[PDB]
Amino acid sequence: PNLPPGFDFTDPAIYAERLPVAEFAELRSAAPIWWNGQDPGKGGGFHDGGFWAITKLNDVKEISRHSDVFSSYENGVIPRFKNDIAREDIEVQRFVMLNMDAPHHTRLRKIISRGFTPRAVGRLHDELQERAQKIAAEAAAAGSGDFVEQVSCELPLQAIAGLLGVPQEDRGKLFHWSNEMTGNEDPEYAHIDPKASSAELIGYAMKMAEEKIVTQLIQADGEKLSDDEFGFFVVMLAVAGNETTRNSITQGMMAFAEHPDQWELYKKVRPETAADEIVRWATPVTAFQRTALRDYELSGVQIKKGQRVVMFYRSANFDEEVFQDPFTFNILRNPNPHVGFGGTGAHYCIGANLARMTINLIFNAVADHMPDLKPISAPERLRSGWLNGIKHWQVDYT
Ligand code: HEM
Numbered sequence: 153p154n155l156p157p158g159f160d161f162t163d164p165a166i167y168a169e170r171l172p173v174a175e176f177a178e179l180r181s182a183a184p185i186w187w188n189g190q191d192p193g194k195g196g197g198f199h200d201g202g203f204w205a206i207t208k209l210n211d212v213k214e215i216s217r218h219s220d221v222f223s224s225y226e227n228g229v230i231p232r233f234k235n236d237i238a239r240e241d242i243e244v245q246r247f248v249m250l251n252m253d254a255p256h257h258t259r260l261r262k263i264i265s266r267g268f269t270p271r272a273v274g275r276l277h278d279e280l281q282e283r284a285q286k287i288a289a290e291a292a293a294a295g296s297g298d299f300v301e302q303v304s305c306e307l308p309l310q311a312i313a314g315l316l317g318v319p320q321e322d323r324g325k326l327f328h329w330s331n332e333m334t335g336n337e338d339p340e341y342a343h344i345d346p347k348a349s350s351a352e353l354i355g356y357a358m359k360m361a362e363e364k365i366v367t368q369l370i371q372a373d374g375e376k377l378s379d380d381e382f383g384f385f386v387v388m389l390a391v392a393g394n395e396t397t398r399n400s401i402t403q404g405m406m407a408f409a410e411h412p413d414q415w416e417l418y419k420k421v422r423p424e425t426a427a428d429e430i431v432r433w434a435t436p437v438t439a440f441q442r443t444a445l446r447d448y449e450l451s452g453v454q455i456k457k458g459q460r461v462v463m464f465y466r467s468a469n470f471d472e473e474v475f476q477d478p479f480t481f482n483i484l485r486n487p488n489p490h491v492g493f494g495g496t497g498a499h500y501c502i503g504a505n506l507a508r509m510t511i512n513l514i515f516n517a518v519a520d521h522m523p524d525l526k527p528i529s530a531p532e533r534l535r536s537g538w539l540n541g542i543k544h545w546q547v548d549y550t
């Protein structure tokens with residue numbers, strides 16, 4: 153592949169500036185499964201010398217289906233942390249369902265599914281609709297400002313808060329904790345600890361369960377979450393459903409600003425197909441990883457026991473062999489077999505429909521209250537080597 157020497161698809165330095173679209177496309181053409189070597193002290197907390205970069209949609213899907221071979225437990229699924237992270241701080245992330253394997257995963261996913269039935273998510277619809285409309289109304293009123301803060305941030309948080317029945321009086325502190333919890337190495341957030349906020353939120357979660365969806369989860373059925381499991385559940389959601397859906401909203405609106413015909417069409421018909429195009433295009437989670445528990449031949453590459461594989465959803469979502477005109481934003485996209493919510497398999501995003509609803513509700517409200525919104529200045533990107541984040545985006549709502 154024509155890539156610079158020692159180029160690392162997980163390098164936070166890249167994502168601080170841009171998405172490496174041209175580099176991904178190069179791999180898809182020249183080396184769709186490619187060993188991304190990492191020098192010592194530069195593996196983002198991993199010290200195994202590198203990982204297999206997975207760039208093709210079907211390979212991402214194959215990995216995600218074969219979780220009997222490709223493990224989330226062994227090194228967790230987050231492929232990049234601060235280079236100096238202690239291993240202990242990686243391993244502790246095995247206490248969330250995301251970073252478990254069968255049979256422990258199966259049991260927790262089965263219980264936590266109580267929270268995510270279409271009926272449970274459907275019940276949140278009206279309050280989130282009301283919240284979305286008021287958010288949009290308040291941003292329109294303010295004239296201009298930070299679209300991330302004023303429009304993208306709060307609804308995903310309210311969706312988490314509503315699913316859990318957090319009292320309104322407690323939502324402020326909950327959101328504060330949640331917003332310090334998804335680790336990054338960005339200089340704007342250098343003074344934030346993850347650790348303290350996580351401890352403090354698990355403390356609240358376990359007090360909440362003590363005082364008591366929360367009911368369904370901690371009530372015996374005789375499967376129930378233990379109080380610490382409920383805590384681990386809440387801490388997981390604070391990361392899983394926060395900056396993920398936020399960046400779908402930010403970058404979907406960015407897509408609309410760049411594709412004014414799509415925005416015009418959206419405002420008329422709010423089509424059913426928009427949310428999934430927004431997710432495909434935003435690809436909030438750039439990459440998650442797995443560790444091979446045995447040797448596995450994947451598209452002619454001999455993957456070895458113990459090696460990491462990094463599924464770059466940002467590549468797979470633009471796979472030219474699958475998506476017609478992948479680099480066209482098409483809100484009527486059909487079909488749309490994207491992996492923005494993961495490959496289908498044991499770990500496929502449990503919050504996918506909760507995210508779609510959040511997305512439709514906010515964009516309906518934006519179309520309603522700020523139909524002529526225009527950016528004032530460039531998005532500011534988050535320094536993360538797995539999260540595709542926009543910290544700030546100054547826009548003129550009128
Ligand atoms: C547009 C927004 C979202 C995106 C792009 C996204 C992305 C993903 C992806 C790629 C995975 C796969 C995990 C893996 O295969 O290793 C996942 C899993 C997960 N997501 Fe989402 N997600 C979003 C919204 C949400 C929301 C709103 C929630 C809940 C409030 C949620 C909860 C979860 C949970 C609990 C898992 C782990 C499932 C398991 O391990 O069994 N997600 N998400």
Ligand SMILES: Clc1ccc(CO[C@H](Cc2c[nH]cn2)c2ccc(Cl)cc2Cl)cc1
Pocket residue numbers: 241242244245247248250333346347350351352354384387388389391392
């Ligand atoms: Cl007191 C606590 C509570 C919870 C965890 C679980 O550890 C990490 C973050 C993390 C914090 N401190 C060290 N590591 C974590 C991983 C994945 C997700 Cl999706 C969410 C979270 Cl919060 C650890 C300690």
